[PDB]
């Protein structure tokens, strides 16, 4: 059956190659795409090739690439290989693209996910020349059905001078109706609307993105998969972490600090946070509700089981086996899931109001519980801050999760001082590693250190950490957040110098 | 005229000394008080004395002291001298108390101001034994009229097992009617209420705090001044900074990125942010609206002039001359001002919705525009984060202000790496020193450094900074946020070692 149900628009169908000629050098391009779901695929490949060509003839051919969040090989990958991106925001997981960034060849700024649309509208990324969005279908009145994510697509369609739609036959047609697009002013000129969500399952908008059809400069038919990587097999660490958390939830419930069905749950991108969801699938908690940025395999798992009654997010980020599972029973899942704009899914007003429990991964935390989510050694970008800021600061409870070591034991995930800071102390209440769980609510920094060190640090590093803290207590310039500046970053330096944080 | 208009309650009047005996060792005590306005005065002095007594006889006598924000000499001062405080939150400006904190004798955690009530309700500070609140009057139906601030008083009255009210004759009776107290669920068990503020001057509640009168265990009559210190005479630096900012606003208006009456303005605690307000009093912008946490002298100034039509806040923090000016012309000001609960004034959902422009001071920022608001050398507490987080992250525009140097030139307020981080890069768009102004919107970290260094850094330090950055670019483990970990914190160490950041 036809995907473009509006007949007049079919005359705008042109091939991927011809569509990409619409994109010029220096263009700011806004695309769909969020955690490897629903990013444009064909036009970027075609644009990539034409970019390499222009380079061999010594012509400049680069764009600024603004997305919802991370994309995939067809987009971040291809443009990175073609060296076609002078600026990138706000979130990436592609290796070629990460390397360009860490080599200074692509400029990068990882904005809070929930703020990107608002900043786009303020003009921060400049003027948008292109909105390139993937669609499941085009309705009879010219509405665009998003695919596996909503992200920032509505805002890009609003701002861009020209619009290109990719209709992707690979995407299940029953995705139609799963989205909730608001025509409210969420991220526009203040004063903004109250976004009246008071329930994780509430719909307040409609099932399509709206765009003036005079702007649609091209529609391209496609058939290509969301290349979403599989989720690491949950190991000994994953399980231990899950257990400590589950016990903690259990005790909150018993003390009547949480209800038996907990609160609306957010779980961030990454293997660890996912592995904890798997733990909950089997746990003793039911009537769970998800209010997140992403629906990862584990969350899809709980929807299946029936332990979670509904999940709100901006996209699903599913492994290839889980992606399959859904394209099949789409009939069943379409009623368990609401896909929103990222500026609504990551709206701090809403997150706080629903009182979400925030579960995110981290690179590292220092003994005081300042968190690093992005920059290894303080200078080398991993993925980005994503929505970890949005949720951590807004949440009812902010929880961070990590193996106590990285790189086969050679790095400690608990350090004297974090090399870069994403989440300050005030934004982290709970730490969980495979060693145990630290509850920091109500503690001074010095009390935070005692808990982090005794509960979360790996036994190979606990004494080194304790030694650092004991001596900082005696010699620090102030005693409120004791530090020895001569050695605060020395574990990181030692790793750079010797390949391990352990002494000789 | 009588202040306690409810006759039945006058039988609960007892003296300050007898009232303080209600407070036991180990008690969590919630008090009024926000930026040196409206904190209880008599009961704390009396409690102070009785604490020293119990100490000489070798008896333990300490409390946990939770407030709205900073208080004054009668409270923070007296209890610090008497060594009566085992825990303190969330914000302090008292020297004796600051020293106890920096010596590890009082435990301290500076929570985001707007979050304190919610965390108190969650139980984070423990169970509240005492609510000690200053009042202007008690109405005929037993409502409590707050004084020069609202802060967290409503939440403390709700939670505390016993309540003590101080009715302070010093406070102008015409403060009655100036407050807007909501009976909505702002900071309680989720799901919370939508707080329906859509314009800075909107009232949504009533003029009094509500408490069950069976909880009022004592009322104490008082007559004592809000001891609010004067504001440093604006110097060479203050004026330069004001000018750069004013020009910037002007250019925003011309480019139609701001309206001619700007947006609702927040100015933080401190001399610098205040001095910039003084600049605006005379500037070319009218119909200004304040939505802030505090009303400092400078803001009161603009209200007077008529340049600012109305100002929302949680308290006024006024010098003794400005305090006088208002107790006289209270009739006029009462209609220019709304005083709200700090969890409403610092509500991120509201701040974002109104699209506030956030102007705050800072200790330091590193070349990448990470901000330090609290910890000198990374370990020594100054005041606290206050509401700078609430506003910076929530705002339409986040601006930070500082002299380019501190301690007579011996410290640089722009450093290779901040010694402690309060505000990440994502939360700071504009920097202004006396050297000039840095606009960081849309820039990668590396592009932020070029702007911060060329625009804001003092000429004595600019080459040192440039040198650090040039070499980090070549040798950093990654190139995205270039650092040399061996020297990142070395300027701070050098200052600890030699008393200056300048080389020999
Ligand atoms: C979408 C959204 O915003 C929703 C809201 C929430 N969004 C966010 O939270 C966005 C930001 N978060 C993330 O990007 C993720 O959670 C991060 C912070 C990256 C954690 O990822 P995770 O999948 O949970 O854990 P793990 O597998 O342990 O580490 C992965 C790789 O980081 C290296 N790694 C891990 N720790 C390390 C360390 N201490 N030192 C050096 N390398 C380390 C490690 O080797 C490995 O690197 P390799 O691929 O080279 O082997
Ligand atoms: C309430 C609310 O939240 C509303 C929302 C906003 N809330 C907030 O922003 C709360 C947090 N903000 C603050 O506490 C304030 O703005 C801070 C960050 C403290 C700035 O204060 P300011 O009054 O604007 O400037 P200045 O007078 O230059 O510095 C004061 C003292 O800090 C030292 N100082 C200044 N810079 C220094 C440096 N680089 N190194 C060492 N010392 C330094 C300096 O010597 C002096 O110290 P001294 O008293 O020993 O002389
Ligand atoms: Cl809202
Ligand atoms: Cl806390
Ligand atoms: Cl609200
Ligand atoms: Cl930006």
From Swiss-Prot, chains A, B:
Alphabetic keyword roster: Transferase
MF (Gene Ontology): acetate CoA-transferase activity; acetyl-CoA hydrolase activity; transferase activity
SUPFAM superfamilies on file: NagB/RpiA/CoA transferase-like
Disruption phenotype: Cells cannot grow on acetate and have lost the resistance to high levels of acetate, a characteristic of wild-type A.aceti.
Factors inducing expression: Expressed at intermediate levels during the first growth phase, when ethanol is metabolized and acetic acid accumulates in the growth medium. Up-regulated during the second growth phase, when acetate is catabolized.
Activity regulation behaviour: Subject to competitive inhibition by coenzyme A (CoA).
Family annotation (InterPro entries): AcetylCoA_hyd_C (IPR026888), AcetylCoA_hyd_C_sf (IPR038460), ActCoA_hydro (IPR046433), ActCoA_hydro_N (IPR003702), NagB/RpiA_transferase-like (IPR037171), Succinate_CoA_transferase (IPR017821)
Active-site residue list: 293
Binding site for CoA: 268-272, 363, 383, 387, 407
Catalysed reactions, as listed in the record: succinyl-CoA + acetate = succinate + acetyl-CoA
Positions of disulphide bridges: none
Entry EC number(s): 2.8.3.18
Pathway, per record: Metabolic intermediate biosynthesis; acetyl-CoA biosynthesis
Its job: Utilizes succinyl-CoA to convert toxic acetate to acetyl-CoA and succinate. Required for growth on acetic acid and for resistance to high levels of acetic acid. Also has low activity with acetoacetate as substrate.
SUBUNIT field: Homodimer.
Family according to the record: Belongs to the acetyl-CoA hydrolase/transferase family.
Name of the protein: Succinyl-CoA:acetate CoA-transferase
């Amino acid at each position: 059956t036809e995907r473009i149900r509006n007949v007049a628009l079919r005359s705008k169908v042109c091939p991927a190659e011809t569509a990409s000629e619409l994109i010029k050098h220096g263009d700011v391009v806004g695309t769909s795409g969020f955690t490897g779901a629903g990013y444009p695929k064909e036009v970027p490949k075609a644009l990539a090739q034409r970019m390499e060509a222009a380079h061999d003839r010594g012509e400049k051919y680069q764009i600024s690439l603004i997305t919802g969040a991370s994309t995939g090989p067809q987009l971040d990958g291809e443009l990175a290989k073609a060296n076609g991106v002078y600026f990138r925001s706000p979130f990436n997981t592609d290796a070629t693209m990460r390397n360009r960034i860490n080599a200074g060849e692509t400029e990068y700024f990882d904005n809070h996910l929930g703020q990107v649309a608002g900043r786009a509208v303020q003009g921060n990324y400049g003027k948008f020349n292109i909105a390139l969005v993937e669609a499941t279908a085009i309705t009879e009145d010219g509405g665009i059905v998003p695919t596996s994510s909503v992200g920032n697509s509505q805002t890009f369609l609003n701002l861009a001078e020209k619009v290109i739609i990719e209709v992707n036959e690979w995407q299940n047609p029953m995705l139609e109706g799963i989205h909730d697009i608001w025509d409210g002013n969420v991220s526009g000129v203040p004063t903004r609307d109250i976004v009246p969500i008071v329930r994780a399952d509430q719909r307040v908008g409609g099932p399509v993105l709206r765009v003036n059809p005079d702007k649609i400069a091209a529609i391209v038919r496609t058939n290509d998969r969301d290349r979403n990587a599989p989720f690491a097999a949950p190991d000994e660490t994953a399980k231990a972490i899950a257990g400590y958390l589950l016990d903690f939830f259990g005790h909150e419930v018993k003390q009547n600090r949480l209800p038996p069905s907990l609160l609306p749950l957010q779980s961030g991108v990454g293997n660890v946070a996912n592995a904890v969801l798997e733990g909950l699938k089997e746990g003793p908690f039911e009537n769970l509700v998800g209010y997140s940025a992403v629906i990862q395999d584990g969350m899809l798992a709980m929807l299946d089981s029936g332990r979670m009654r509904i999940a709100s997010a901006s996209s699903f980020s599913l492994s290839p086996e889980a992606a399959e599972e859904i394209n099949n029973r789409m009939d069943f899942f379409r009623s368990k899931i609401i896909l929103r704009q990222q500026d609504v899914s990551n709206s701090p007003g809403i997150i706080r109001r629903l009182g979400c429990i925030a579960m995110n991964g981290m690179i590292e935390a220092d003994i005081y519980g300042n968190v690093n989510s992005t920059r290894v050694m303080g200078s080398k970008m991993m993925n980005g801050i994503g929505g970890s800021g949005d949720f951590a600061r807004s949440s009812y409870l902010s929880i961070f999760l990590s193996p106590s070591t990285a790189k086969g034991g050679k790095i400690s995930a608990i350090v004297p001082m974090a090399a870069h800071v994403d989440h300050i102390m005030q934004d982290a209440q709970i730490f969980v590693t495979e060693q145990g769980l630290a509850d920091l609510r109500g503690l001074s920094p010095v009390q935070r250190a005692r808990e982090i060190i005794s509960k979360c640090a790996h036994p190979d590093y606990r004494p080194m950490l304790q030694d650092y803290f004991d001596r900082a207590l005696k010699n620090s310039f102030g005693k409120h957040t004791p530090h020895l500046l001569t050695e605060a970053l020395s574990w990181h330096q030692r790793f750079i110098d010797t390949g391990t944080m352990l002494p000789s």
